[PDB]
Amino acid sequence: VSESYRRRRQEWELQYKQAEWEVNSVEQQINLQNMQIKAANKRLEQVEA
Amino acid sequence: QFGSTLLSLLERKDSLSFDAYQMIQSGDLYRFSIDLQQQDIDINKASLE
Protein backbone atom coordinates (compact mmCIF):
# COMPACT_ATOMS: atom_id res chain seq x y z
CA VAL A 1 0.00 0.00 0.00
CA SER A 2 2.77 2.43 0.87
CA GLU A 3 4.48 1.99 -2.46
CA SER A 4 1.12 2.31 -4.18
CA TYR A 5 0.65 5.76 -2.71
CA ARG A 6 4.16 6.61 -3.80
CA ARG A 7 3.37 5.77 -7.41
CA ARG A 8 0.15 7.73 -7.16
CA ARG A 9 2.16 10.76 -6.16
CA GLN A 10 4.58 10.28 -9.04
CA GLU A 11 1.60 10.40 -11.32
CA TRP A 12 0.10 13.50 -9.75
CA GLU A 13 3.42 15.29 -10.03
CA LEU A 14 3.83 14.63 -13.72
CA GLN A 15 0.18 15.46 -14.34
CA TYR A 16 0.20 18.87 -12.71
CA LYS A 17 3.48 19.90 -14.26
CA GLN A 18 2.12 19.18 -17.72
CA ALA A 19 -0.96 21.24 -17.03
CA GLU A 20 1.39 24.00 -15.92
CA TRP A 21 3.08 24.03 -19.30
CA GLU A 22 -0.28 24.29 -21.02
CA VAL A 23 -1.13 27.25 -18.82
CA ASN A 24 1.97 28.89 -20.16
CA SER A 25 1.04 28.22 -23.78
CA VAL A 26 -2.23 30.08 -23.67
CA GLU A 27 -0.32 33.27 -22.86
CA GLN A 28 1.43 33.03 -26.19
CA GLN A 29 -1.96 32.79 -27.79
CA ILE A 30 -3.01 35.98 -26.04
CA ASN A 31 0.02 37.85 -27.32
CA LEU A 32 -0.64 36.70 -30.86
CA GLN A 33 -4.25 37.80 -30.66
CA ASN A 34 -3.19 41.25 -29.53
CA MET A 35 -0.86 41.58 -32.49
CA GLN A 36 -3.71 40.42 -34.69
CA ILE A 37 -5.94 43.14 -33.30
CA LYS A 38 -3.29 45.71 -34.14
CA ALA A 39 -3.20 44.44 -37.70
CA ALA A 40 -6.97 44.65 -38.05
CA ASN A 41 -6.84 48.23 -36.89
CA LYS A 42 -4.22 49.04 -39.49
CA ARG A 43 -6.44 47.52 -42.16
CA LEU A 44 -9.34 49.73 -41.18
CA GLU A 45 -7.08 52.77 -41.17
CA GLN A 46 -5.88 51.89 -44.64
CA VAL A 47 -9.38 51.53 -46.04
CA GLU A 48 -10.35 54.80 -44.41
CA ALA A 49 -7.44 56.71 -45.88
CA GLN B 1 -7.16 79.79 -84.69
CA PHE B 2 -5.18 81.26 -81.82
CA GLY B 3 -7.96 80.76 -79.32
CA SER B 4 -8.55 77.14 -80.25
CA THR B 5 -4.84 76.46 -80.19
CA LEU B 6 -4.46 77.80 -76.68
CA LEU B 7 -7.48 75.88 -75.45
CA SER B 8 -5.89 72.60 -76.44
CA LEU B 9 -2.86 73.49 -74.36
CA LEU B 10 -4.91 73.97 -71.25
CA GLU B 11 -6.54 70.62 -71.80
CA ARG B 12 -3.08 69.09 -71.99
CA LYS B 13 -1.99 70.81 -68.81
CA ASP B 14 -4.90 69.69 -66.68
CA SER B 15 -4.42 66.17 -67.98
CA LEU B 16 -0.85 66.09 -66.75
CA SER B 17 -1.74 67.72 -63.46
CA PHE B 18 -4.34 65.06 -62.87
CA ASP B 19 -1.96 62.23 -63.56
CA ALA B 20 0.72 63.72 -61.33
CA TYR B 21 -1.68 64.23 -58.46
CA GLN B 22 -3.03 60.73 -58.84
CA MET B 23 0.42 59.17 -58.80
CA ILE B 24 1.66 60.97 -55.72
CA GLN B 25 -1.65 60.26 -54.02
CA SER B 26 -1.33 56.56 -54.72
CA GLY B 27 2.21 56.59 -53.35
CA ASP B 28 0.94 56.84 -49.76
CA LEU B 29 -0.78 53.45 -49.49
CA TYR B 30 2.60 51.76 -49.31
CA ARG B 31 2.92 53.16 -45.81
CA PHE B 32 0.10 51.00 -44.48
CA SER B 33 1.22 48.13 -46.67
CA ILE B 34 4.67 48.13 -45.11
CA ASP B 35 3.25 48.44 -41.62
CA LEU B 36 1.03 45.41 -41.90
CA GLN B 37 3.60 43.26 -43.70
CA GLN B 38 6.19 43.87 -41.02
CA GLN B 39 3.57 43.23 -38.37
CA ASP B 40 2.97 39.81 -39.87
CA ILE B 41 6.66 39.07 -39.64
CA ASP B 42 6.61 39.79 -35.94
CA ILE B 43 3.53 37.62 -35.53
CA ASN B 44 5.38 34.73 -37.09
CA LYS B 45 8.24 35.29 -34.68
CA ALA B 46 5.86 34.93 -31.76
CA SER B 47 4.44 31.73 -33.26
CA LEU B 48 7.92 30.31 -33.51
CA GLU B 49 8.46 31.10 -29.86
Experimental method: cryo-EM
Q: Structure resolution in Å?
A: 4.6
Residue B46: closest CA among A13, A25, A2, A40? A25
B48 touching chain A per CB within 8 A: no
Of A28, A39, A49, the CB nearest to B46: A28
B41 touching chain A per CB within 8 A: no
DSSP string, chain A: -HHHHHHHHHHHHHHHHHHHHHHHHHHHHHHHHHHHHHHHHHHHHHHH-
Find which of A26, A27, A36, A42 to mutate to test the B interface (most B CBs within 10 Å of its CB).
A42
d(CA A47, CA A24): 36
